[PDB]
């Protein structure tokens, strides 16, 4: 037979926790081939690219998810995070901010985990001001 896109995402999720980020990204890629219209495949592969320090690759997958779901709190948060590492402070804090009001409007039980990144991003900016 051949695994479903859901099973490929699940296998990729396991390799991510397993710290095999190249392998996890490849599983997400095969999921995408089976069904290219599921946003979480892209955000999760982008997260792989952040860990591997391939920041352009992670930007692209975050942008692809935002085309599928412009309201994605997760895609904005990963996009904001990625831009923070590239010293693109002004972009990171804008995207991190939009994840915050989007999480507000959707009433999501995430926690102080977006404000934390937002504070650290804004005050890492004032260093290299």
């Amino acid at each position: 037979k051949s695994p479903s896109a859901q099973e490929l995402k699940e296998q990729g999720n396991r390799l991510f926790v397993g710290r095999k980020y190249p392998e996890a990204a490849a599983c997400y890629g095969r999921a995408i081939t089976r069904n290219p219209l599921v946003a979480v495949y892209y955000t999760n592969r982008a997260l792989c690219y952040l860990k591997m320090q391939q920041h352009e690759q992670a930007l692209a997958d975050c942008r692809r998810a935002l085309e599928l779901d412009g309201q994605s709190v997760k895609a904005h948060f990963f996009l904001g995070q990625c831009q923070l590492e590239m010293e693109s402070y002004d972009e990171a804090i804008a995207n991190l901010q939009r994840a915050y009001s989007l999480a507000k409007e959707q009433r999501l039980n995430f926690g102080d985990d977006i404000p934390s990144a937002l504070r650290i991003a804004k005050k890492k900016r004032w260093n290299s001001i």
Binding site: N44, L47, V73, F78, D113
Partner: peptide, 10 residues
């Protein structure tokens, strides 16, 4: 909490 974000599909 990178696991929580990873599993988040909403």
């Amino acid at each position: 909490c990178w696991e929580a974000w990873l599993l988040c599909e909403t």
